Amino acid sequence: MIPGANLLRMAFGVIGTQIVKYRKFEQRVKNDQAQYVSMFEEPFDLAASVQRVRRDQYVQFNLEFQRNYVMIFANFEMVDLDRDVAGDQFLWTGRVFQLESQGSWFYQDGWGVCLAVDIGAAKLTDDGKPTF
Amino acid sequence: MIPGANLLRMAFGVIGTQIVKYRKFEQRVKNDQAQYVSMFEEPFDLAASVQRVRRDQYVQFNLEFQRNYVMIFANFEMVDLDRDVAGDQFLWTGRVFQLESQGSWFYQDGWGVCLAVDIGAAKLTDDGKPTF
Amino acid sequence: MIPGANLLRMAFGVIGTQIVKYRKFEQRVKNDQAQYVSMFEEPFDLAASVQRVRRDQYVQFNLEFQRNYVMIFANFEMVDLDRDVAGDQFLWTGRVFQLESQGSWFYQDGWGVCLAVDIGAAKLTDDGKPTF
Amino acid sequence: MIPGANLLRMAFGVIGTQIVKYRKFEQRVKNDQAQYVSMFEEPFDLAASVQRVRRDQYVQFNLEFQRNYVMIFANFEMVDLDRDVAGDQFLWTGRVFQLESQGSWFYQDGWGVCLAVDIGAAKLTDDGKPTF
Amino acid sequence: MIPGANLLRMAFGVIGTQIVKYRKFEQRVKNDQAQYVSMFEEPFDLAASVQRVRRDQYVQFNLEFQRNYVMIFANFEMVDLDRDVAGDQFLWTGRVFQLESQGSWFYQDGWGVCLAVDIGAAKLTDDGKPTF
Amino acid sequence: MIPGANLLRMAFGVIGTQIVKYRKFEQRVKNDQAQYVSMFEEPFDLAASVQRVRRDQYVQFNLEFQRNYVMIFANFEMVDLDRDVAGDQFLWTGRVFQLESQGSWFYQDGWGVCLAVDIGAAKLTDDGKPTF
C-alpha cells in the first residue's frame, strides 16, 4: 500500500542523494555548573536529500544575526528535542546541523523530513576527514 | 449519495491503514484536591490513517518545548474536549494521544478527522503489549 | 440566467441532503432584569447540507473551551444577529444551533450559507423526538 | 481592445442582472450643530450584479454588532468617500447601501466594482414602491 | 532572449494602452521655512496600462480618509522616492499621480510597474487641456 | 541526476543573462573607533539573472525611506552575513549591492539565489568604467 512501503526510497531511484554523517542521541548528563552535556552513538553514513531553506538575516540587540537552515529528507527515524531527550546531529559539507522540526512519517512510511540549523564548523581529522 | 455512504471506508480500499487502540470517555469524577480524574470505557481496535503534523520546537520560560501532533482520519465518531466531557484517547506506537481538534463529518458521512497530541509513553504489559 | 434560478436546488439533485428543524425569529421582549427573551415562529423542516467547520479547543481564564461550528447551505432566507433582530435557530442531531455569519445569496439566487454555533442538547419530547 | 470596450457589458449578456436604484452625490452643506448634511441627484435605475460578501458578527463594548456587505459590479462610474465629497447611495431589496471601497476600472473599461454597506430600511412610498 | 527584448512592448500589440502625461524629476531646492520644493523636466506623453488597485476607506483622528491608487505598467524607466531624489509624476484623467512603489524590470527588460497615489485635481489650461 | 548537475547552467541556455561585477569577502579588521572595515578579493565578472523585488517606500522618524532590492540567481557560491564574516558585494548598472538573504542550493546543485540591497552609486573610473 502507498502509505506503507517507502515513498522516499522509490523517489531516491530517480533524484540524486547526498551523503550526510548522521549521529544519534545516546544519553545526556549534567557536568558541573548545571550546564548539561549531551552524548551520542557512533556516527554512521545516511543517504538523504538536503534541500535549502531561505535564510534571512535579522537584527537583535543592535547586532546582525542569521539562522542557517537546511530541510533534510532522509529514510530514517529522526528525532529532535523531546522530553528527557536532546536533538540529533548530522554533518554535511563540514558543517554541524541539528534538527529543529520533525516531519515524522516514519512509522507510517519509513522516511522523515526535518528542519535543521547549522551549529558551526566541523572538527577536522588529522587525515583531512570533515568529521569529529 | 456522496455526502452519505462512507468516503473514508471506500478510500481505505486503496490506501493502507494503521491499527490504533482507541478508548472512549465513560464518566469522570473529582478526586481529592479538586484535581479531577477522567476514566474511560474498554479499549477497542480502530482502523485509521494517522498522518503527520509538522511539529516545531519553541521556547517558554527559557526552556525548550515541542508539541507532538498527529492528524488521525478514522471511521468513527470522535469527540475531544466538551462541556462536562473530557477528551478521548488512542494508543499508537506505544504513545498515548489525546484529541485536540474535531473535523466532525460523522453524522454527515460516518468518518472524522482529529488533531491529537502525544501525552507520553504507554504502559508496558507483562507480556510486552504496548497498552495500559 | 445562472445568477438567477437556484443553483443549490439543482445541486441537491445529485448530492445528499440532511433534514434540520429550522425555526425563525418572531419577536423578543425584555423580561425582568433587562435581559431579553427571544420568541420564534413555528418550527418547520428544512432541507440543507450541513458541512463541518474545523473546531479547535482554546484556553481562557485557565480553563479549556471549544466552540462547535457547522456551515449550513440551505435553500431559504437565513438571518443571524441584526439591529432589532435576534438570530435564527435550527435543530440537528439533537443539538441546537444558531447562525453566526451570513452568506446571503438569497435575493440573488434563493439559497444561502451560514456559520452556526452549537448551543446545547435538545429538549427530548415524551415520544422521544429531539425537538423543543 | 480588451482593456477598452466594456467587459462587464459583454458579461451581462449571459449572466443575469439585478436592478438597483442608484443615486449620485450632488452637494453637501452643514446644518446646525456642525453635523453635515448630504444631498444627491435624482435617483435612476442601474443594472448591476450585486454579489455577497461574508458578513460576520462581532462584539464591541460588550454588545453584538454585524456589518452587512454587498459587492456590486455595475457599468457606471461609482465614487465613494473622497476629499470634499461624500459617497454615493443605491437601493436594493428595500435596503439602503453606501459604497465603502472602489474597484475603479471605469476610465480604463467603463465598469466598476464597489463594496457597499447596508445603512437601514428603505422608506416606503404611499403606493408601496420601496424608494425614498 | 525573453528577459531581454521588451515583453511589455509586445504585450501592447494586443491589449490597449492609455496615454498619460509623464513628467520627470529635475533637481530640487528648499524654499523658506525648510519646506523643500521639487521641480521637474518638461512633460511628455507616455503609453502605459493603468490598472486599478482596490482602494478602501479608513478612519484616522475620527475622520474618514481614503488613499487612491493606480498600478501603472509603462515602457519607461520610472523612479519614485530615493535618497536626494523626489518621486516622479504623471497626469491621467485630470488627476495627478505620484509613484509609490517601484517594480523595476527596466535595466533587465526596458519596462516597469509602479503603484501610484492620486495627489489632487489637475490644473486646467485656458484652452481646456488637463495639464499644468 | 537532477538535484545534481546544474539546473541554472542549462536554464541560462534559453533565457538571457546579465553580467555583474562580483566581489568576495576576504578579511575584516577593526580600524580606530572599533568599527570594522571590510576588505575583499579581486573583483570578477559573474553571469547571473537579476530579477526585481517589489520595493515600497515607508516612513521612519517622520522621514520617508525606501529599501532597494534585487533577487540575483547566480551560478556561484554566494555568502551573506555570517558569524565572523561579512557579506559579499556585486556591482550592477553602476550600483553597489550586498546580499541579504541566502537561497543556498550550491552544494546541492552549484547555483544560488540571494536578495541584495542597494548601497549607493558606484565609483567612476578615469576611463568611465562603473567599477571600484
Nearest 10 degrees: CA dihedral of C56, C59, C63, C66?
-20
Asked if residues D51 and D18 have their Cβ atoms less than 8 Å apart, the reply is no
Q: DSSP string covering E63-93, please?
A: EEEE--EEEEEESS----SBTTB---EEEET
Task: Name the grid cell of D86.
Answer: 461624500
What Cα–Cα distance (Å) separates residue B128 from each residue in B23, B46, B94, B123?
19, 20, 11, 10
Which residues 6+ apart lie within 8 Å of C73 measured at CB?
A: C8, C48, C49, C50, C51, C111, C112, C113
Structural biology method used = cryo-EM
HEC-encoded secondary structure of chain A: CCCCCCHHHHHCCCCCCEEEEEECEEEEEECHHHCEEEEECCCEEEEEEEEECCEEEEEECCEEEECCEEEEEECCCCCCCECCECCCEEEECCEEEEECEECCCHHHHCCEEEEEEEEEECCCCCCCCCCC
Interface test with C, best of B6, B104, B117 (most C CBs within 10 A): B104
What is the signed CA dihedral for D65, D71, D77, D79, rounded to 10 degrees?
Answer: 20
Residues 6+ apart with CB under 8 A from C100: C69, C80, C81, C87, C114, C115, C116, C117, D56, D57
Give the Cα separation of A104 and A111 in Å (integer): 8
For B66, which of A2, A3, A80 is closest by C-beta distance? A80
Does residue C88 contact residue C81 with C-beta atoms inside 8 Å?
A: no
C-alpha closest to that of C49 among F63, B105, F23: B105
Rounded CA separation C101/B104 (Å): 19
- The CA angle A51-A57-A61, to the nearest 5 degrees, is 140
Question: From CA A119, how far away is CA A122, in angstroms rounded?
Answer: 9
Distance from CA of C15 to the nearest CA of B (A): 6
List of chains touching B (3+ CB pairs within 8 A):
A, C
**Gyration radius from chain C CA atoms:** 16
| CA nearest neighbour of A117 among A95, A98, A90 | A98
Provide the residue type at C92 as one letter: W
Cβ of D54 within 8 Å of Cβ of C2? The answer is: no
Assess contact for F36 and F29: CB atoms under 8 A.
Answer: yes
Chains A and C touch (3+ CB pairs under 8 A): no
Interface test with C, best of D12, D14, D50, D52 (most C CBs within 10 A): D52
Q: What span, in angstroms and rounded, lies between the C-alpha atoms of A46 and A108? A: 20
The burial of E49, by beta-carbon neighbours within 10 Å (0-12 exposed, 13-18 middle, 19 or more buried), is given as: buried
As a whole number of angstroms, the distance between CA E51 and CA E63 comes to 28
Which three three-digit cell numbers place residue A89? Answer: 546531529
Cell numbers 449578456 correspond to what residue? D13
